[PDB]
Design an enzyme around this catalytic site. Structure first.
Site, short mmCIF file in Angstrom:
data_model
loop_
_atom_site.label_atom_id
_atom_site.label_comp_id
_atom_site.label_asym_id
_atom_site.label_seq_id
_atom_site.Cartn_x
_atom_site.Cartn_y
_atom_site.Cartn_z
N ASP A 10 51.37 26.73 36.19
CA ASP A 10 50.08 26.57 36.71
C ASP A 10 48.95 26.42 35.60
O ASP A 10 48.24 25.39 35.60
CB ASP A 10 49.55 27.25 38.01
CG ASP A 10 48.45 26.45 38.69
OD1 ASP A 10 48.38 25.23 38.40
OD2 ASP A 10 48.02 26.98 39.75
N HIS B 235 42.75 18.60 39.15
CA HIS B 235 43.60 18.81 40.14
C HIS B 235 44.34 17.48 40.83
O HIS B 235 44.40 17.34 41.93
CB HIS B 235 43.19 19.77 41.12
CG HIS B 235 43.08 21.17 40.74
ND1 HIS B 235 41.56 21.65 40.71
CD2 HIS B 235 43.79 22.02 40.47
CE1 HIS B 235 41.74 22.92 40.22
NE2 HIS B 235 43.25 22.96 40.11
C1 LIG Z 1 41.63 26.01 37.49
C2 LIG Z 1 42.86 26.76 36.79
O1 LIG Z 1 42.13 27.51 35.65
C3 LIG Z 1 42.46 27.31 34.31
C4 LIG Z 1 43.53 26.56 34.01
C5 LIG Z 1 43.60 26.43 32.48
F1 LIG Z 1 44.57 25.73 32.02
C6 LIG Z 1 42.82 27.22 31.83
C7 LIG Z 1 41.53 27.52 32.10
C8 LIG Z 1 41.32 27.73 33.49
C9 LIG Z 1 40.32 28.48 34.13
N1 LIG Z 1 40.10 28.86 35.21
C10 LIG Z 1 38.77 29.71 35.43
C11 LIG Z 1 38.35 30.11 36.53
C12 LIG Z 1 38.92 31.56 36.93
O2 LIG Z 1 38.18 32.53 36.04
C13 LIG Z 1 38.57 33.81 36.21
C14 LIG Z 1 39.25 34.44 37.13
C15 LIG Z 1 39.67 35.91 37.14
C16 LIG Z 1 38.99 36.53 35.84
C17 LIG Z 1 39.21 38.12 36.11
C18 LIG Z 1 38.67 39.35 36.82
O3 LIG Z 1 38.37 40.37 36.06
C19 LIG Z 1 37.45 40.13 35.06
C20 LIG Z 1 39.29 39.46 38.17
O4 LIG Z 1 40.27 40.17 38.23
O5 LIG Z 1 39.13 38.62 39.22
C21 LIG Z 1 38.26 35.90 35.11
C22 LIG Z 1 37.65 36.75 33.97
C23 LIG Z 1 37.12 36.31 32.88
C24 LIG Z 1 36.70 34.95 33.05
C25 LIG Z 1 37.12 34.10 34.15
C26 LIG Z 1 37.99 34.66 35.08
C27 LIG Z 1 38.22 29.65 33.97
C28 LIG Z 1 37.04 29.99 33.38
O6 LIG Z 1 39.25 29.04 32.99
MG LIG Z 2 46.05 25.12 43.29
ZN LIG Z 3 47.54 23.71 39.99
#
Ligand SMILES: CCOc1cc(F)ccc1-c1nc(CCOc2ccc(C[C@H](OC)C(=O)O)c3ccccc23)c(C)o1
Ligand SMILES: [Mg+2]
Ligand SMILES: [Zn+2]
Length: 313
Positions: A217, A68
């Protein structure tokens, strides 16, 4: 007035593409952003002296966190540039001004912790902003920097145009709260499929700009595989630090954030591509057909993550 920014030939060509990587030379990123503003907006949009002073104060207020950071900001701004340039006639003069600035500003003064962690820590920002905690802070920092002497890049707008552009920037920055994305995309899905989506409806525009902001993003998932793969190391470096801090508060972190469960990363990426990224770029390609390369690149990366899991890398 007659002072154009130009880029070396490879960047000049590759910057037009969604999957462009801004590269490892920090001192070129400001020039890259100005180049994108001049072609996306015009050479007259901003007074160059004010723009340059604005860019450098924004950079100064990003922290040295693994993901970030200042590089993320310019990366997210480049994805928006690519969307805007592939949808020339769909956006107003003010939207083009506001959205590139919103993207550069969207993670201002990020500490590398989620809204969740701020809330469990009991951070003062969680008292001041109950929901979208970091995102309301990011916007607040944007207004602060705009109000520094010499930094009002919008000085030439009317009073009401100024309030419109700051309102575009506010909604755009709030929309980067991934908690808000799920509902936002579901609504755009239903509106698109029942044929009620109307781009002259301001509340419909807001939603579509919200989805573009999520698409920009997450745009690390839309790069060539070696960029996607190495960015995932920066992402997890932050998540694992947060998991550590959760353990310090006497809380077992979700496995995603637990550095003792590194083995679960490839399956967590699968889940994330299936639950978040693929739906995001699908709905976006439906509403904005020229953004299809983002969907295609995302699918390619999903397949690369399946290959990691199958021990094929
Ligand atoms: C920081 C910005 O995040 C990224 C940006 C990228 F270019 C690539 C990956 C992430 C990334 N973020 C996460 C964290 C957020 O993870 C999730 C949020 C929401 C859901 C969905 C959830 O339903 C299953 C809901 O509705 O909250 C997820 C589901 C499976 C795995 C990670 C999830 C991961 C593992 O990878
Ligand atoms: Mg942010
Ligand atoms: Zn961002």
């Amino acid at each position: 007035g007659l002072m154009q920014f130009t880029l070396p030939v490879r960047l000049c060509k590759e910057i037009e593409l969604f999957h462009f990587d801004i590269g490892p030379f920090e001192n070129m990123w400001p020039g890259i952003f100005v180049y994108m503003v001049h072609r996306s907006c015009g050479t007259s949009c901003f007074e160059l002296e004010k723009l340059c002073r604005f860019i450098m104060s924004v950079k100064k207020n990003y922290r040295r966190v693994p993901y970030h950071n200042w590089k993320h900001a310019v990366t997210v701004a480049h994805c928006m540039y690519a969307i805007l340039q592939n949808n020339h006639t769909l956006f107003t003069d003010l939207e083009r001004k506001g959205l590139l600035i919103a993207c550069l500003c969207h993670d201002l003064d990020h500490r590398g912790f989620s809204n969740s962690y701020l809330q469990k820590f009991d951070h003062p920002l969680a008292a001041l902003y109950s929901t979208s905690t970091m995102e309301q802070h990011h916007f607040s920092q944007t207004v602060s920097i705009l109000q520094l002497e010499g930094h009002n890049i919008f000085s030439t707008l009317s009073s009401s145009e100024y309030e419109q552009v700051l309102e575009i920037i506010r909604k755009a920055i709030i929309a980067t709260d991934l908690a808000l994305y799920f509902g936002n995309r579901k609504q755009l899905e239903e509106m698109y499929q029942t044929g009620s989506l109307n781009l002259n409806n301001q509340s419909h525009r807001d939603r579509v700009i919200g989805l573009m902001m999520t698409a920009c993003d997450l745009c690390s998932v839309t790069k060539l595989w070696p960029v996607t793969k190495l960015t995932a190391n920066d992402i997890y470096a932050e998540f694992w630090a947060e998991g550590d801090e959760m353990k310090k508060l006497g809380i077992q972190p979700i496995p995603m954030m637990d550095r003792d469960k590194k083995d679960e990363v490839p399956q967590g990426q699968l889940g994330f591509y299936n639950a978040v990224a693929i739906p995001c770029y699908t709905t976006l390609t439906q509403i904005l057909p020229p953004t299809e390369p983002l969907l295609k690149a995302c699918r390619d990366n999903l397949s690369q993550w399946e290959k990691v899991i199958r021990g094929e890398e």
